[PDB]
C-alpha cells in the first residue's frame, strides 16, 4: 500500500512555489556577499558551489531555511589525516612560489580553520550592514547564519576545493560499479573534493584545526542521474521511485525530530544519516526494476528496514569513506538509536501517523 506515501509526495510537491519565492531573496544577498568577498586577496577565487537538497530536488518542508556552500580553490595542498579518523585532516602547503593568498591564516605549517572562518565571518558581518535593499541580520556563533527580512535563515558554509586525487580513505568507497558503472565511478573520482571546517572531539575536547571531507557535488550528480539505464525517468515505461523513497525517509526523520524536539534524543540524527542509508540501499538494489513506481510501498519498506538494521547493529558507514561509521557508539549513544528504532517501528506498524503533521 503506497496511498499515504503518494499522498505525502503530492503535498510535498506543493511547497515548490513557496521555496522559489524565498530563494529569490537569498540569491540576491548571496551574489552580493560573493562580490564583496572576491575583493579580499585571500577569498579571491571564492564562488558558489550549488549542491544540497535544493539542487538535488529533494528539498522537503522548509522554505524559510536555506543552506549555501561557498567553494574556494586552494592550489597545491598536502593533507595529513588527524588521529586515524579517515574523515578529518590538517591542511598543509608544499611549494615555494607564488606567495600563497592564505599565508595570513597559517598557524604554523598548518592552515587554521578558526583564523580562516573569522576573516570569512568578519567580511560577511561587514557587508551585511552596508546592504540597504533588504533587512539582513547575522546570527551568533554556535559557519555563518543570516536572517533575511526576519523570515529566511541562510546557513553559509566555506569549503576548500582541491582538484587533487581523493584521499586513500575513499579508495574502497562509492560502490556504484554494479549500479551506475565503473566507467562513471572513474569519471566522478577525477572531479575535485571539498574540505569543510569541522573540529573533531575525542571526548575530553575539541581539535579546532581540522577539516572534514565533503562530496556534496558527487551526491548531487548520483541523485540527478540515478538509474542503471540512461533513460531512467525519461518515459512512462522507465519511471522509478528512488528519489521518492529518499524524500519520504528524509520527511520521516524530520517529522519524528519535530514531534520529539522537546525530548532531546533525536537531536544527534540528521538527514545525512538517511541519505547515506539511501545510497547503501541503491548499491544493494542496482536494477531499475527493483525501483519500479508501482513498488513504492515495498521500496520504501526496504529503506525503512535497512535504516532500522543500521540503528540496531550500530553500523552506518559513510558512502565515500567506508571506515568512518556514522552510527558509532562514540557519536550516537545506544539509548538514542533505540528510541528512534521504537518510533520508526511504531510508525511503520500504524500506517505512518506522523505523516499527518505531528
Ligand atoms: O550533516 C552531515 N553529517 C552529520 C552526520 C554524522 C556525522 C557529521 C554530522 C554533522 O556534521 O552534523 C553532512 C552533510 N553533508 N555531509 C557530507 O557531505 C559529508 C559528511 C561526513 C560525515 C562523516 C565523515 C565524513 C563525511 N557529513 C555531511
Ligand atoms: Zn529513475
Author numbering: 161 to 302, 307 to 522
Text taken from the publication that reported this structure:
Cyclic GMP-AMP synthase (cGAS) is the most recently identified member of the family of cytosolic DNA sensors. Cytosolic cGAS binds dsDNA and in the presence of ATP and GTP catalyzes the production of the recently characterized second messenger 2′, 3′- cyclic AMP-GMP (cGAMP) which then binds to Stimulator of Interferon Genes (STING). In humans, the binding of the cGAS product to STING causes a conformational change resulting in recruitment of TBK1, and interferon-inducible gene activation and interferon production via IRF3 phosphorylation and nuclear translocation. Activation of cGAS is important in host defense against pathogens, but uncontrolled activation of the cGAS pathway has been implicated in autoinflammatory disease.
The evidence linking activation of the cGAS pathway to autoimmune disease suggests that cGAS inhibitors may have therapeutic efficacy. Taken together our results demonstrate the druggability of cGAS, provide a high affinity active site inhibitor and establish a sensitive screening assay with broad utility for cGAS drug discovery.
